[PDB]
Structure 1
Amino acid sequence: SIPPEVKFNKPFVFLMIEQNTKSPLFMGKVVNPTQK
């Protein structure tokens, strides 16, 4: 595909950062969205 297709349809890690301090606000890995 063009532009190329990037789907988050699978387990992925992520995180949040505050820019000023660059400190790691929260960090996660999403294995099943429906498990809450």
Structure 2
Amino acid sequence: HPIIQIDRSFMLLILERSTRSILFLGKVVNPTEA
């Protein structure tokens, strides 16, 4: 089966289907930043 490894910079979207709304949008460059 195909391997998908989210191990470098990625964009992220959270959407609600019934309204087709983007609730949150982002890019994760360094997931350990504080």
- Percent identity, please: 44
Computing the radius of gyration from Cα coordinates, the structure with the larger value is 1
Runs of 4+ in 1 over 2 A off after TM superposition: none
Normalising by the residue count of structure 2, what TM-score does the alignment of the two structures yield?
0.84
Normalising by the residue count of structure 1, what TM-score does the alignment of the two structures yield?
0.81
5+ long unaligned stretches in structure 2: none
| Corresponding residue pairs, total | 34
5+ long unaligned stretches in structure 1: none
